[PDB]
């Protein structure tokens, strides 16, 4: 189970961007501050740092550990 479709149902624990960079916990306003958090979107599996699709993008993504790259997709195939 990679992801399916636009991967809105992705509920896996994969956390790396296509560029090997690492994902930022969704709760955390650091490095990047967002409103796509577990307390705003109670039903979007926004667990820890896992690759999600809270906003109907085209595959799971995540903000970054890289103070410089806010977000990026994730290294997942199209199931």
From Swiss-Prot:
PTM per Swiss-Prot/TrEMBL: N- and O-glycosylated. The N-glycans are complex biantennary structures present in either a mono- or disialylated state. The O-glycans are mostly (80%) represented by the monosialylated core type I structure, NeuNAcalpha2-3Galbeta1-3GalNAc, with smaller amounts of disialylated and non-sialylated O-glycans also detected.
Ranges that cross the membrane: none
Positions glycosylated per UniProt: 75
Disulfide pairings: 2-79, 23-62, 51-74
Kringle domain: residues covered: 1-79
SUBUNIT field: Disulfide-linked to apo-B100. Binds to fibronectin and decorin.
Leftover remarks: Apo(a) is known to be proteolytically cleaved, leading to the formation of the so-called mini-Lp(a). Apo(a) fragments accumulate in atherosclerotic lesions, where they may promote thrombogenesis. O-glycosylation may limit the extent of proteolytic fragmentation. Homology with plasminogen kringles IV and V is thought to underlie the atherogenicity of the protein, because the fragments are competing with plasminogen for fibrin(ogen) binding.
Family label: Belongs to the peptidase S1 family. Plasminogen subfamily.
Functional description taken from the UniProt entry: Apo(a) is the main constituent of lipoprotein(a) (Lp(a)). It has serine proteinase activity and is able of autoproteolysis. Inhibits tissue-type plasminogen activator 1. Lp(a) may be a ligand for megalin/Gp 330.
Full protein name: Apolipoprotein(a)
Organism: Homo sapiens (Human)
Gene: LPA
Full-length numbering of the shown residues: 1615 to 1693 of 2040
């Amino acid at each position: 189970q990679c992801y399916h479709g636009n991967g809105q149902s992705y509920r896996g624990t994969f956390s790396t961007t296509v560029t090997g960079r690492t994902c930022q916990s969704w709760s955390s306003m650091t490095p990047h501050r967002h409103q796509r958090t577990p307390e705003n979107y109670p039903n979007d599996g926004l667990t820890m740092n896992y690759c999600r699709n809270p906003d109907a993008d085209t595959g799971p993504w995540c903000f970054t550990m890289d103070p410089s790259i806010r977000r990026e997709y994730c290294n997942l195939t199209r199931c």
